[PDB]
Amino acid sequence: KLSEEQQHIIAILLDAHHKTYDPTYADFRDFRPPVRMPLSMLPHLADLVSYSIQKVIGFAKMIPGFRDLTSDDQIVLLKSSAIEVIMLRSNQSFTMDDMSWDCGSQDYKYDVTDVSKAGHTLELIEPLIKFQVGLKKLNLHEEEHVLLMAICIVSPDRPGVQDAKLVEAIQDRLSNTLQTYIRCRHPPPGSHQLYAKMIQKLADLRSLNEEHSKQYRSLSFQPENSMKLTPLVLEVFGN
């Protein structure tokens, strides 16, 4: 039942991920360096998020049907989903062992206290960790992981969407791809309710999104902190 179009979609999204996710973490030495020994980690982690946004954009451009949207709608969708896709794609380096994101080295291994040192509180960090745990336990196929990222970006209910009709139809082809993939290539019992569970993770991300933007607006209302951000982070997340 996995149609030729559907196998096509999966091939494109896998490739788009491998082109925008480098598991060597080579570029990390270009960021402002991490400091731990004051929002110590805000320069290094703002650099990471700004880099990650560019990677998310390059992925979104390759999602089939996305380019048939207008640039206004594309902007809307990326502005709303950027932090969610970043949290979701960070799951690949997350290790449940010491509850940290191990991106290669110890300098580039981040725990909950590093996230605190960028200005964020456990109001965000506590659901964020349980999010990463629950995703980690879904044991997702790479096929499913990249479909989930695509569905996240192309959402019809984002605030300010203009052609909700076209956005809905683009998402629908991706959701139907995912549902058929699960049915055909994911054996029970891991397949049990798997689609519903993945959609629950998107709901987890809407809540995480709202809390991020509250603490961001608090953070960036202090001009001392705005100064440590990047111009892309400011345009996307605000002010």
Binding site: Q54, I57, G58, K61, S71, Q74, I75, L78, K79, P231, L232, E235, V236
Partner: peptide, 10 residues
């Protein structure tokens, strides 16, 4: 109001 976004989106 989004110069860098639109440049990155091609």
């Amino acid at each position: 109001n989004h110069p860098m976004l639109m440049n990155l989106l091609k």
